[PDB]
Amino acid sequence: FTRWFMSTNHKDIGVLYLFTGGLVGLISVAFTVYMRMELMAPGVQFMCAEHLESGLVKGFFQSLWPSAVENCTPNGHLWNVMITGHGILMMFFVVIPALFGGFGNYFMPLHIGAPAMAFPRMNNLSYWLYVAGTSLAVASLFAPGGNGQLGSGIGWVLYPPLSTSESGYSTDLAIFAVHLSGASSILGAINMITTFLNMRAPGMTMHKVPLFAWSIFVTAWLILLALPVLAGAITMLLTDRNFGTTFFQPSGGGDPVLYQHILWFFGHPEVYIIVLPAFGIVSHVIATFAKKPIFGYLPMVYAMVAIGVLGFVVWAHHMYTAGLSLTQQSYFMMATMVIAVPTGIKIFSWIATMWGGSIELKTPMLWALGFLFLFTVGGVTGIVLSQASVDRYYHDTYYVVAHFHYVMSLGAVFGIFAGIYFWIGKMSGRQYPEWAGKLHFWMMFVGANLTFFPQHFLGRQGMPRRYIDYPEAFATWNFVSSLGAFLSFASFLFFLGVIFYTLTRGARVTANNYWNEHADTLEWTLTSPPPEHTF
Amino acid sequence: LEIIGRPQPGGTGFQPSASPVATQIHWLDGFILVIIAAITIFVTLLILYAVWRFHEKRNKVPARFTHNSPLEIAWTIVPIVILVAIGAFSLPVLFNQQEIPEADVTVKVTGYQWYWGYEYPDEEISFESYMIGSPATGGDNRMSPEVEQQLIEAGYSRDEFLLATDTAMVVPVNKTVVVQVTGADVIHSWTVPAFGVKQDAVPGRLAQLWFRAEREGIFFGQCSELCGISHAYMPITVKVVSEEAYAAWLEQHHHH
Ligand code: HEA
Ligand code: HEA
Ligand SMILES: CCCCCCCCCCO[C@@H]1O[C@H](CO)[C@@H](O[C@H]2O[C@H](CO)[C@@H](O)[C@H](O)[C@H]2O)[C@H](O)[C@H]1O
Ligand SMILES: CCCCCCCCCCO[C@@H]1O[C@H](CO)[C@@H](O[C@H]2O[C@H](CO)[C@@H](O)[C@H](O)[C@H]2O)[C@H](O)[C@H]1O
Ligand SMILES: CCCCCCCCCCO[C@@H]1O[C@H](CO)[C@@H](O[C@H]2O[C@H](CO)[C@@H](O)[C@H](O)[C@H]2O)[C@H](O)[C@H]1O
Ligand SMILES: CCCCCCCCCCCCC
Ligand SMILES: CCCCCCCCCCCCC
Ligand SMILES: CCCC[C@@H](O)[C@@H](O)CO
Ligand SMILES: [Ca+2]
Ligand SMILES: [Cl-]
Ligand SMILES: [Cu+]
Ligand SMILES: [Cu+]
Ligand SMILES: [Cu+]
Ligand SMILES: [Mg+2]
Ligand SMILES: [O-]
């Protein structure tokens, strides 16, 4: 019923965010499949201008079947719209809503022994702002946009003057979408912080709070500083476009590079906002399935705090070729290298946790171990990129695409899957089938590596970002990358089948704690699912 | 001229170096690659070992330790040492890249939607450079018989489609070229992988890069900041030639 959507309980809101994030995730993943269909071979075969002469529905279906090059006038605007749509959905409407909005709202209060959150009504509103933002982002795709077509082909970070000169109002709708996302995140962040500070159970001191609850707390602080700054940046785009300002227009005395400083001041924190809750989940999962308490609890907390703090002083590593002085480049290179120490270290603590344990290779543990490998592969190419002299070559190439799909995209995704399998029995009263979870893992693991590892080669060979088409020499590794993407997609559809099965006819969960004694936090103390009123 | 600065089928490495700066990038990246491949193999082998050795069937009773000070000190300092080492080789390379020397040849480049404009202020030469196959050359950004013919006529082949332009930026070998880069409308980015150079072309700003090409040939780049519908379709061709051939090219442009 629609008694779900009016609920103010943190558990119901958590579930709403997870399902919604999953659905938006499906839409955005489907964009990537279409993207990889076009990148599978050189020459444009799918995104043909000829499909525009048909209707919106007719044109859609025609563009899913390949044409010969001689019958396909390349439509670069569509490429640009799809990738911008993919990026914006992922960065604002998928992974943070799932990790922070979803698991954050469901589990943090349980972990700190809070029976309710500080602002249940505000929490419900945060969800609705998320949905409204999502709707506007999607609406922008069908709105008068650049080049006399629909949608904005401007990149997820919306650089002016391109974003400010894009025609139609598609771009204004996208800016409004992002405002609504920021508002949702800010309300959530205020809720999380106040709950964490005022509503811990008697006895629950700061040094006894589980790592996941900490990860959410730190993330919430990052949101309160970072998101208001983004709101500034995008309002200035909005006024340049509609209200006669020239913040980013040289003719009026503006500087487009100013936008980049402000955008990236949000933009770096954004990635740590994405991954910090995944760190929390990994810590809970590894401890449970290694049957061994987390190694260095206090260093783990402090490493998270240090990463949070330092993530505000590294932003211009996204701007090494934008015209930064040699002094600026050198500083940001060094600040970036520093943050690599607390971050890359937590990896050793996770391995030390496993060391000497009694390891059970259940589905959630597989995702967690996948995380350790893949986050390392991604983090390590980050180090390469921090070196401005080498970034000269790699910037705006597929090497960067490989990096971030490695540390961030797949890190957040493997953390999300780890959480779902870890917690689905607890949330639903029904258990997933073990063989299917493992099959999902191996399919996703092989698929994702086949998709993204060859993109390192494409970048080293000089393939730029945001290209509908590419020189014939890049064909081999684009083909492999596309096959990987198709296999990952297959694994995701299988996953959705697994979730449907689990929720409709999964084995009944009868235990409060269906794992083992080393799942020692408070949710495993409650029934499965927990009662409407906990503690 | 030999086509040198281009991607090669199935390639996994950098494009060939044709400048001292590109050489430095290749060495530095190769050095870091050794290190990060070592770190990755290490981390991977530790996980796989721990899972084999401490599997629940092999280690039935788990340990309970949460500390190991000497190991924690080692695993904190060693990363710090690794990064200081990298930074020590990396910063000089960076300083070399970004300190602009005295120019033998000066070119001013302007990015437009969707083509590049070149000016040689010392020579009073200017021209525009469009992709072969763009609307400017009669095409619509795709291969066709006409486009292949134009590629042939210009001294290329169908394999250089998306890379080759109707006109090239010509420079003499073993001379210091300083390129001043700006944008006319939106941000573009001017780059040549073989030279180890990239610089955004921002409206309202004039930014500088340098290179010295160490061998003759043809070298390609592609616009590296999303700039709208034909971002994929406004590449860069540099031809490095003898001093005499460069002079000959210059005289061809002189109006008497
Ligand atoms: C999960 C989020 C996340 C994380 C954690 C990281 C981690 C790192 N990132 Fe990455 N980055 C992104 C998300 C993330 N990145 C995104 C989204 C972009 C591009 C956005 C866009 O343009 O669209 C980007 C782009 C990006 C750039 C700009 C590239 C360009 O545009 O040209 C740079 C430059 O320095 C960089 C550097 C680094 C570094 C040095 C790390 C380090 O923190 C990594 C630390 C290292 C590891 C985790 C490896 C494991 C280490 C050990 C096991 C031992 C430790 C030892 C040592 C460090 C020596 N990143
Ligand atoms: C979390 C962030 C995230 C994620 C998960 C992904 C997922 C994927 N990305 Fe994405 N990507 C971005 C963020 C992300 N991307 C960004 C920011 C850009 C830049 C856009 C720009 O240029 O402006 C980009 C750009 C980008 C490019 C470069 C486009 C270009 O430069 O022209 C490509 C190329 O193949 C690509 C491919 C893919 C593929 C095949 C997948 C996936 O198909 C991989 C397979 C993964 C799955 C099948 C599982 C997905 C699961 C979820 C999403 C969780 C859903 C939630 C729940 C279940 C609760 N992406
Ligand atoms: C003394 C004599 C008085 C002269 C007065 C005449 C004023 C001329 C207006 C200039 O504005 C032009 O408008 C075009 C149309 O809006 C633009 O074309 C753009 O839009 C077209 C479609 O409208 C596309 O076909 C083009 O490719 C694209 O460049 C073009 O860039 C822009 O400069
Ligand atoms: C940089 C990459 C590193 C990746 C991490 C993986 C390596 C982890 C090695 C852990 O080393 C163990 O630490 C324990 C604690 O320090 C020691 O126990 C010792 O101390 C315990 C704590 O009091 C006692 O219970 C034990 O009996 C006593 O053997 C034990 O000997 C030692 O082997
Ligand atoms: C007293 C004197 C009065 C002034 C009279 C000047 C009249 C002639 C102006 C021509 O304008 C050009 O039109 C092109 C064709 O429309 C545009 O190409 C644009 O559009 C093409 C087709 O989409 C793209 O391929 C190009 O890259 C893109 O620059 C180009 O920008 C624009 O300058
Ligand atoms: C003669 C053309 C080859 C046929 C291959 C077309 C496959 C298109 C698959 C589209 C399915 C949507 C994901
Ligand atoms: C650990 C991540 C490494 C990703 C880079 C792969 C580069 C392959 C090097 C090939 C060089 C061929 C000459
Ligand atoms: C090589 C011929 C030199 C001609 C020279 O006068 C011109 O480049 C100046 O306009
Ligand atoms: Ca294609
Ligand atoms: Cl509540
Ligand atoms: Cu960053
Ligand atoms: Cu461009
Ligand atoms: Cu471009
Ligand atoms: Mg750029
Ligand atoms: O980032």
Is B59 in Cβ contact with A351 (below 8 Å)?
A: no
Nearest Cβ partner for A162 among B14, B97, B226: B226
Per DSSP, the three-state class of A173 is: helix
Q: What is the resolution of this structure in A?
A: 2.2
Q: Is A491 helix (H, G, I), strand (E, B) or coil?
A: helix
Contacts of B63 in chain A (CB under 8 A): 292, 355-357
Q: Give DSSP secondary structure letters for A449-489.
A: HHHHHHHHHHHHTTPBSS-S---GGGHHHHHHHHHHHHHHH
Nearest Cβ partner for A345 among B14, B75, B141: B75
Interchain contact B199–A (C-beta under 8 A): yes
Torsions phi, psi for A534 (to 5 deg): -90, 165
Q: Does A225 reach chain B within 8 Å, measured CB to CB?
A: no
The domain ranges of chain B are: 6-101, 102-254
Question: What are the φ/ψ torsions at residue B94 (nearest 5 degrees)?
Answer: -60, -45
Residue positions of B in the annotated binding site for Mg(2+)?
200, 225
Amino acid at B9: P
Chain center to CA of A323 = 29
End-to-end CA gap in chain B: 29
Q: Are B75 and A372 in contact (CB under 8 A)?
A: no
Residue A446's SS3 state is helix
- How many Å lie between the alpha carbon of A226 and the closest alpha carbon of chain B? 25
User: Residue holding tokens 């494409």?
Assistant: A458
Closest C-alpha to ligand 4, atom 32: B68
Summarize the annotated binding site of B for Cu(+) as residue ranges. 188, 223, 225, 227, 231, 234
Length of chain B: 256
Residue to test with chain A: of B17, B32, B94, B163, most A Cβ within 10 A: B94
Give the containing element (helix H, strand E) for A507. Answer: strand A507-508
Please give the distance, rounded to the nearest whole angstrom, from the Cα atom of residue A381 to the centre of ligand 1: 7
Q: Chain B: residue nearest A160 by CA?
A: B186
What does each C-alpha distance from B150 to A25, A361, A398, B19 come to in angstroms?
45, 60, 30, 30
Element holding A430 (H helix, E strand): strand A430-431
Architecture (CATH level 2) of domain A1-535: Up-down Bundle (1.20)
Which residues 31-60 of B are in CB contact (within 8 Å) with A?
32-33, 36, 39-40, 43-44, 46-47, 50-51, 54-56, 59-60
The method recorded for this entry reads X-ray
Helix axes A363-386, A434-460, angle to 10 degrees: 10
CA max distance for chain A: 73
C-alpha A358/C-alpha A355 separation (Å) is 9
Closest among B229, B115, B154 to A468, alpha carbons compared: B229
Q: Are A63 and A519 in contact (CB under 8 A)?
A: no
Q: What is the DSSP string of A326-390?
A: HHHHHHHHHHHHHHHHHHHHHHHHHHHHHTTS-B---HHHHHHHHHHHHHHHHHHHHHHHHSHHH
Q: How many CB pairs under 8 A join A and B?
A: 282
User: How close are the terminal C-alpha atoms of chain A, in Å?
Assistant: 27
**CATH of range B6-101; options 3.40.50.720, 3.40.50.300, 1.10.287.90, 1.10.8.10:** 1.10.287.90
Looking up tokens 């103390």 gives: A525
What is d(CA A255, CA A248) in angstroms, rounded to the nearest whole number? 5
CA distance B143 to B147: 6
CA dist., res. A418 & res. A363, Å (int): 8
Phi, psi (rounded to 5 degrees) for A313: -125, 20
Could you give the residue ranges of the DSSP H alpha helices within A387-461? 388-394, 398-404, 410-428, 434-460
**Helices A105-112 and A410-428, interaxial angle, to 10°?**
70
Does B142 sit within 8 Å of A43, measured CB to CB? yes
Q: Which residues of A319-350 are buried (b: 16+ CB within 10 A; e: fewer)?
A: bbbbbbeeeebbebbebbbbbbbbbbbbbbbb
What separation in angstroms does the CA of A253 have from each of A247, A258, A320?
8, 12, 23
Q: Which ligand is nearest to the CA of A29?
A: 2
Do B84 and A311 form a contact (C-beta atoms < 8 A)? Answer: no
Q: What are phi and psi of B90, to 5 degrees?
A: -80, -40
Q: How far apart are CA A151 and CA A52, in angstroms?
A: 13
Which H or E run contains A508? strand A507-508
Q: How far apart are CA A353 and CA B216, in angstroms?
A: 57
Tokens of A350: 């996770």
From CA A265, how far away is CA A226, in angstroms rounded?
Answer: 7
Per-residue 3-state assignment (H helix, E strand, C coil) for chain B: CCEEECCCCCCCCCCCCCCHHHHHHHHHHHHHHHHHHHHHHHHHHHHHHHHHHCECCCCCCCCCCCCCHHHHHHHHHHHHHHHHHHHHHHHHHHHHHHCCCCCCEEEEEEEECCEEEEEECCCCEEEEECECCCHHHCCCCCCCHHHHHHHHHCCCCHHHCCCCECCCEEEECCCEEEEEEEECCCCEEEEEHHHCEEEEECECCCEEEEEECCCCEEEEECCCCCCCCCHHHCCEEEEEECHHHHHHHHHHHCCC
Residue A505 assigned to a binding site? no
The three-state (H, E, C) secondary structure of B124-156, written as one string: CEEEEECECCCHHHCCCCCCCHHHHHHHHHCCC
SS3 A130: helix
> How many angstroms is it from A123 CA to the middle of ligand 3?
50
CB of B247 closer than 6 angstroms to any ligand 8 atom: yes
Q: Which residue of A has its CA nearest to B78?
A: A341
Q: Enter the tokens of residue B216.
A: 């003759």
Closest CA to A77 of B232, B33, B96, B207: B232
Please state, in angstroms and rounded to a whole number, the distance separating the CA atoms of residues A223 and B226: 28
- Nearest atom in ligand 5 to the alpha carbon of residue B134 is 25
Provide, as residue numbers in chain B, all residues whose Cβ is less than 8 Å from the Cβ of A297: 66
Q: Is B98 in contact with A329 (CB distance < 8 Å)?
A: yes
Q: Helix count (H) and strand count (E) of chain A?
A: 18, 2
Compare CB distances from B60 to A338, A358, A387 and report the shortest one's residue.
A358
Contact at 8 Å (CB) between B116 and B128?
Answer: yes
A358 contacts on B by Cβ (under 8 Å): 54, 56, 59-62
Q: In a mutagenesis test of the A interface, which of B224, B233, B237 is the best target, namely the one with the most A β-carbons within 10 Å?
A: B224
Instruction: Give the CA distances from residue B8 to residues A225, A469, B166, B231, in Å, rounded to whole numbers and listed in that order.
Output: 46, 16, 22, 22
Q: In angstroms, how far is CA B238 from the centroid of its own chain? A: 13
Radius of gyration of chain A, Cα coordinates, nearest whole angstrom: 23
Q: Does domain B102-254 have CATH number 2.60.40.420?
A: yes
The residues, any chain, with a CB within 8 Å of residue A163's CB and separated by 6 or more, are A152, A154, A171, A237, A241
The answer to whether residues B191 and B216 touch, using CB atoms and an 8 Å cutoff, is no
Residue whose CA is at the smallest distance from ligand 5 atom 23? B135
Min Cα separation B142/chain A (Å): 7
**Residue of A257, A265, A254 lying closest to A232 (CA atoms):** A265
Non-local CB neighbours of A380 within 8 Å, separated by 6+ positions: B36, B39, B40
Which residue of A398, A403, A456 sits with most ligand 7 atoms within 8 Å of its CB, as the best mutation to test the pocket?
Answer: A456
Q: Are A126 and A184 in contact (CB under 8 A)?
A: yes
**3-class secondary-structure state, position A431:** strand
Among residues A337, A341, A220, A343, which one has the least CA distance to residue A279?
A: A343
Whether A403 has a binding-site annotation, put simply, is: yes
User: Within 10 Å of residue A524's Cβ, how many Cβ atoms?
Assistant: 19
Give, for A269, the enclosing helix (H) or strand (E): helix A256-290
For residue A123, count other CB atoms closer than 10 A to its CB: 27
Give the torsion sign (CA, A279, A281, A283, A286). negative
CA–CA dist A368, A350 (Å, integer): 10
Breaks (C-N over 2.5 A) in chain A follow: none
Partner residue facing B203 (CB), from A250, A334, A393: A250
Task: Decide if A156 contacts B226 (C-beta within 8 A).
Answer: no
Report the distance separating Cα A419 and Cα A526, nearest Å. 17
> B188-192 and B217-221 as β-strands: parallel, antiparallel, unpaired?
unpaired
Say which DSSP state A41 is in: S
CA of A65 to the centre of ligand 6 (A): 5
Q: Tell me the best of B134, B227, B230, B233 to mutate to test the pocket of ligand 5, counting ligand atoms within 8 Å of each CB and taking the most.
A: B230
Please list the alpha-helical segments (H only) found in A142-255: 162-165, 170-198, 211-242
For residue A527, the SS3 value is: coil
Joined tokens for residue A20:
């919604």
Is B97 an interface residue toward A (CB < 8 Å)?
yes
Q: Is A148 at the interface with chain B, CB within 8 A? A: no
- Whether the CB of A403 is below 8 Å from some CB of chain B: the reply is no
Q: How many angstroms separate the Cα of A422 from the Cα of each of A67, A177, A358, A483, A502?
A: 45, 32, 18, 29, 13
Note the maximum CA span of chain B: 93
Contact A216, A100 (CB under 8 A): yes
